Structures are given as structure tokens and as C-alpha cells.
């Protein structure tokens, strides 16, 4: 009948999202088939309620009481079909699965809960308890003006403790990570490595039923066949575009292209724990080498603008009086002398295997950072790894300089600078291995602040520290496409880059 077809760049690392921390597994997961407890509005950063139909905050920002909505139903699968409504101990599982290191499901599937960690909830959490069936409160150690707007996002999912108990009790518990059942408004319909996943609407989704019946992920790794398909009417919607078929696509009469600034950050990282990057001097000289502008030119063809902060231009806090590093390659060479290193150094740049929001072609910006360096006595290999293999290997530390990228996902300028930039995350998402006390201490008082105007001048603060600084060079922030064919309708892109169908219709 009404099926959407999606295609797709890559295969999802997973189908659960608590366990994974990537847009491809999100897009193919919780974007379809979970619900949240508070959700955005399509397009937009702005919160409406969920499967919380409301909740209330104590005068001292410490106490959340989430009033659970009624009659909501999850799916059903051939393994599984529910006996009762969602309720207040599907939030507890969902939350304590993360939370308790010895809950029966913190170690199916080997889970690691990366995204939980990133975002520090093992110490912000003191309490998420069952008040009733349909009554929830969640208790935190210390403020935080974000919460509310975190629990939007994709890694605290709302799972179904039933399923869980079932599958446990049938010896098979990883099958709530492998074959997603939840409350969303699209059913999982099943996978097929390499070629798809299927999704169907949820007939009884709480908030009404949706009107594309059918949705399809097909993954189609050629750019130039994704294009292809598109134009024959094939796929509704693809995937980072090659640039040329992009330059098409602006003007073809069969497409109907989105975009959109992305709130998104590509970079290159120096790892600062690491000789001889953790030489302030060597991290600015590095920064002076690189010329930005050809970057924009060569890689994102216009279509992205050369970063100046690893806060985007587009959210709040961001600081419109910092400058970028003066591209000089004779700035370069004279802190390289007095750091040591008139005749420069030999190292390693770290080059992303796929392609992710924020540069259409890590390699290429490598390969362009690389002739860079070169001219001013730094000599590199280009070093990769497979996706997974290559980010556990950054965790680590065992990089020396690397590309990497990052979108924000709940709107807040903490959910950049927490994750990349605080000193607890080193080994988590700062992969610079940045600690700083002074940005330490903005950070943390920033984010319990209500005051925005207040919040902001003191992001505005850790800008000027992050410049000085220099952990990274800041490189470029992207444009988001999505192009689509001309029968999609009513069709937003997410400020955060994600697929969201739910709201979409097809026409005739
Ligand atoms: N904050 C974490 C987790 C969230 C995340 O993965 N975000 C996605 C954007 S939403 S996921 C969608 C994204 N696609 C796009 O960026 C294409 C444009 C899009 N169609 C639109 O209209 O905005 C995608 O496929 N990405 C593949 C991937 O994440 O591995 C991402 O690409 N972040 C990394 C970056 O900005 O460099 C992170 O950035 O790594």
C-alpha cells in the first residue's frame, strides 16, 4: 500500500539503542519503533510530553515526578505478544539496566551503555523509583537544566520489562536487543544483513496511527546507485549524496531537496595527554598550519562553512567574538621552534573509515591536514582502522591526532562541551583526553543554572578557554541534505540530523 522506502548508506551496528551511540542504528531503531518519556517536536528542539503525559520538578531541581500516560500498547513479534499496557516498571527496567551493574540485563548482549556514560547519569542519578503503576520519580544528586531535554534521547529508550522477563525466563535474553519490541508509532518487521530492515505501522500507536503503512530501510552503499534509485522512483529518501549528484540534485525537478545548517562539529583531535600534543604551543602550531578554507573547498564544496568554536553558529551560547586560527604556516614553524621542534617531528593523522553528518570525506580532509603539516616539518602516515575497531582504539588513547565528528542530540550547548570536552569522559567521548579544572568548573556550574542568559555568558567563557587551549582543530560544520522524491509530504528533517517518519504521508 503506502510503503516509504528509505535508503540507507550503511548496515545498523545494532537494533538497540541503549547499547550503541550512532546515527545509522539509531535511524533504524529508536527513531521508529521506541518512544521516549518526553520527545521533541518534529523539527524543532522545543519538548512536548511522551509516554510522560506530564511531570513536575521540585523547587530545588532535584525531584522529577513523571505522570505515566495510560492505554499505551507495545508491539508484538512472533516471540512476544504483551498481556498488559506500558507502566512504571518498563521505566524502571529501562533505566536500571544501565544503572545497576548487577540488574539481570546489564551484561546481555556484553552491553557497554556508552551514551549513558557519556552523559554522566551514574552520578547524576541518585533514585529512579517505581511510585505506582503509573507514577514515576526520578531523584538527582546535583541540578541539571538539560534533564528533561536528555530524556528525549535515543539511548534511554522506553524497553519493555515483559518482553525482558519472557525472553529471560526462555533462555534467550539477547533477543530484546536483537528484535526491538516497543511502544513507537513503527513495529520492527525484521532484518536481513546486508540488504534491509522493515518496519510497519503500529496500528494502536498511542498518539494515533501514522500514515505510511510500510517502511523499508534499504541499505544501498553506492552513493551513485542511491542517486540512480531516487531518480527512478526507487527510494523516497537517501543518504549523503556524492558531490556532483548533489549539484544535480539542487535543480532536478524529481527531487525535493532539504537542508539545513547542521548543528554538528567536524574536527581534528589531538590527543593532549600524548607528547608531543600535550605541548600547547605544538596544538596551536598545528592549528596555524592548516589552511580552512581549501578544506571547505576541496571536501564540503561549499556546502559548509570553516568552524571556528566546536559550538555550531546556530545554538545558543555559542561565541560570535572568537576567532579561528589565522591560517600561517610561519606562525606554525616558530612555536614548532620553541616548543623544540625546529626540525619538526613524525607522527600519525588517524583517518575516519565512513561517513558520518559532519565531512562528507574524512580521508580527503586527512589527506589535506596531512600536506599541511608536511610544509612545516610534520611528517605523517595516514592510519585507519574499521569502524568499530577505530573508535574503541581512540577511547583508548592510542591515537596521536584523529578526524572525528559529532552532532548534539538534545539542543543544549552542554551536549557538546560535557561530552567532549569534560575531564570524565576521557576514555568515553573526549577523545583528545582533554582535563581542564577551570572548564571543569564553568561546565558544571552552567548546567545547573535556570538562568539561560547566565548559562550562556559562561559557555560563551569556556570558548575563549577551549580556544586557548586548542584540543582540536576545530575544522567545519556541515549542511544537512536529505533529498527526497517529489510524492513525499509533510516531510521535516530533525535539527539533529535524524530520520524521524512518523507525521510523513505519500501521495498519489
Ligand atoms: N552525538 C553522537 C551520537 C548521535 C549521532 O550519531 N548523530 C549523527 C547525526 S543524526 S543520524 C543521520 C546521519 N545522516 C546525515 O547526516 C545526512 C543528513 C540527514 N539526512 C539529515 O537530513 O539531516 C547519519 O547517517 N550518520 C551516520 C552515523 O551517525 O554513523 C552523526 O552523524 N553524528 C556524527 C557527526 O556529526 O559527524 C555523535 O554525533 O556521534
Given at each position: 500500500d503506502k510503503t516509504f522506502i528509505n535508503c540507507v548508506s550503511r548496515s545498523p551496528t545494532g537494533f538497540s539503542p541503549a547499547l550503541v551511540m550512532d546515527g545509522i542504528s539509531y535511524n533504524a531503531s529508536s527513531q521508529q519503533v521506541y518512544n521516549r518519556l518526553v520527545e521533541f517536536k518534529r523539527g524543532s528542539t522545543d519538548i512536548e510530553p511522551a509516554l510522560a503525559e506530564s511531570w513536575t520538578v521540585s523547587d530545588d531541581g532535584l525531584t522529577y515526578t513523571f505522570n505515566l500516560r495510560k492505554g499505551v500498547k507495545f508491539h508484538s513479534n512472533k516471540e512476544f505478544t504483551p498481556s498488559r499496557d506500558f507502566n512504571a516498571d518498563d521505566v524502571v527496567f529501562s533505566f536500571q539496566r544501565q544503572?545497576?551493574?548487577?540488574?539481570?540485563?546489564?551484561?546481555v548482549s556484553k552491553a557497554t551503555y556508552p551514551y549513558f556514560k557519556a552523559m554522566k547519569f551514574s552520578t547524576l542519578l541518585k533514585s529512579v523509583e517505581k511510585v505506582d503503576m503509573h507514577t514515576v520519580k526520578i531523584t538527582l544528586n546535583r541540578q541539571d537544566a538539560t534533564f528533561l531535554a536528555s530524556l528525549g534521547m535515543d539511548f534511554i529508550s522506553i524497553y519493555s520489562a515483559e518482553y525482558a522477563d519472557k525472553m529471560l525466563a526462555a533462555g534467550k535474553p539477547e533477543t530484546i536487543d536483537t528484535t526491538p519490541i516497543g511502544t513507537g508509532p513503527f513495529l520492527f518487521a525484521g532484518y536481513q544483513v546486508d540488504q534491509k530492515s522493515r518496519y510497519l505501522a503500529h496500528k494502536e500507536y498511542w498518539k494515533g496511527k501514522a500514515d505510511i503503512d510500510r517502511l523499508i530501510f534499504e541499505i544501498v552503499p553506492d552513493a551513485t546507485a542511491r542517486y540512480a534509485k531516487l531518480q527512478a522512483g526507487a527510494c523516497d529518501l537517501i543518504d549523503f549524496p556524492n558531490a556532483a549528484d548533489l549539484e544535480k540534485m539542487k535543480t532536478d525537478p524529481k527531487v525535493n531537496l532539504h537542508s539545513q545548517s547542521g548543528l554538528n562539529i567536524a574536527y581534528i583531535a589531538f590527543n593532549t595527554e600524548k607528547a608531543p600534543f600535550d605541548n600547547v604551543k605544538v596544538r596551536q602550531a598545528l592549528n596555524y598550519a592548516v589552511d580552512k578554507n581549501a578544506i571547505i573547498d576541496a571536501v564540503y564544496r561549499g556546502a559548509g562553512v570553516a568552524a571556528k568554536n566546536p559550538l555550531p553558529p546556530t545554538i545558543w551560547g555559542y561565541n560570535n567574538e572568537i576567532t579561528g586560527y589565522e591560517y600561517s604556516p610561519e606562525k606554525a614553524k616558530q612555536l614548532l621552534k620553541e616548543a623544540g621542534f625546529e626540525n619538526g617531528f613524525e607522527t600519525d593523522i588517524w583517518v575516519q573509515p565512513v561517513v558520518r553528518?559532519?565531512?562528507?570525506?574524512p580521508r580527503r580532509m586527512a589527506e589535506l591536514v596531512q600536506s599541511d603539516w608536511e610544509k612545516v616539518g610534520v611528517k605523517s602516515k595516514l592510519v585507519s582502522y574499521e569502524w568499530g575497531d577505530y573508535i574503541k582504539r581512540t577511547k583508548a588513547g592510542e591515537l596521536t591526532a584523529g578526524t572525528y565528528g559529532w552532532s548534539g542530540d538534545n539542543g543544549d550547548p552542554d551536549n557538546f562541551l560535557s561530552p567532549l570536552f569534560?575531564?570524565?569522559?576521557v576514555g568515553n567521548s573526549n577523545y583528545a583526553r582533554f582535563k581542564n579544572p577551570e572548564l571543569d568548573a564553568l561546565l558544571h556550574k552552567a548546567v545547573?543554572?535556570?538562568?539561560k542568559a547566565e548559562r550562556a555568558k559562561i559557555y560563551e567563557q569556556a570558548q575563549v578557554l577551549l580556544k586557548e587551549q586548542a584540543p582540536w582543530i576545530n575544522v567545519a560544520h556541515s549542511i544537512n541534505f536529505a533529498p527526497t522524491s517529489?510524492?513525499?509530504?509533510?516531510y521535516k528533517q530533525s535539527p539533529f540530523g535524524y530520520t524521524y517518519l512518523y507525521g510523513t504521508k505519500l501521495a498519489d
Open positions: 544503572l545497576d551493574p548487577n540488574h539481570p540485563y546489564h551484561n553528518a559532519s565531512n562528507p570525506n569534560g575531564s570524565e569522559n545547573g543554572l535556570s538562568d517529489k510524492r513525499v509530504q509533510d
